[PDB]
Amino acid sequence: MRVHTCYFCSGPVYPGHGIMFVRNDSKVFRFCRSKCHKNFKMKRNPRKVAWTKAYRKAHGKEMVYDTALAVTAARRNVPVRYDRNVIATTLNAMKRVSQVHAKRERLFYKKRLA
């Protein structure tokens, strides 16, 4: 159960939603909706499309990074042994990261408005 990121909108793609597209280079494009899928079909550049996350990232409208709580998430290809206490701590860690990430989400907007 993985919530993937759309190639175009960089938004959350959940099971059932959107489309998955495989290229001859075995590379997989997942689209959150038909609008993003068609935009890939006309091959519009995400950074050049005004509403995409890639545009909002590489135009100064969103933060380069946030090491909130020194870590937020990562693509871990090495599986980890289960532990109830560890699975507990990360869940508390996740909400703490989200709250702090929400905190910077507000100051930065104040900075841009200023």
Binding site: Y14, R56, K61, E105
Partner: peptide
């Protein structure tokens, strides 16, 4: 059950709850 979709069936919903919708979207 594992996961129950609650995205906005009006239009093309892509956010199950407003909380995480606000988390992803810039404020």
């Amino acid at each position: 059950l594992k996961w129950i979709d609650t995205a906005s069936k009006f239009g093309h919903g892509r956010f199950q709850t407003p909380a995480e919708a606000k988390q992803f979207l810039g404020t």
